[PDB]
DNA sequence: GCATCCGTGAGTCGAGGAAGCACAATTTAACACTTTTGTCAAGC
């Protein structure tokens, strides 16, 4: 996205900011239950 | 011979909550009666 996140933690983000935040922060969490799920399915592979 | 489609797989522990009758055949209980067993008392 070309706007940036021009607010700082420190003296915090406005609203509009917060919503284009969650689009990122909330893909990668759901990047983390993927990941770890086929990381299994590929030791299982390796280990037999 | 080629591609569409069926088959197989996609993390680990936890924790918790919802028709009716008749009639023959048969097994089951029910009873009268005999043997088999546990018993009390008395005497050898």
Redesign the pocket.
Known sequence: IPRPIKSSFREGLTVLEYFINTHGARKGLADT?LR??????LT?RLVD
């Open positions: 239950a770890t799920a086929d990381s299994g399915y299982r």
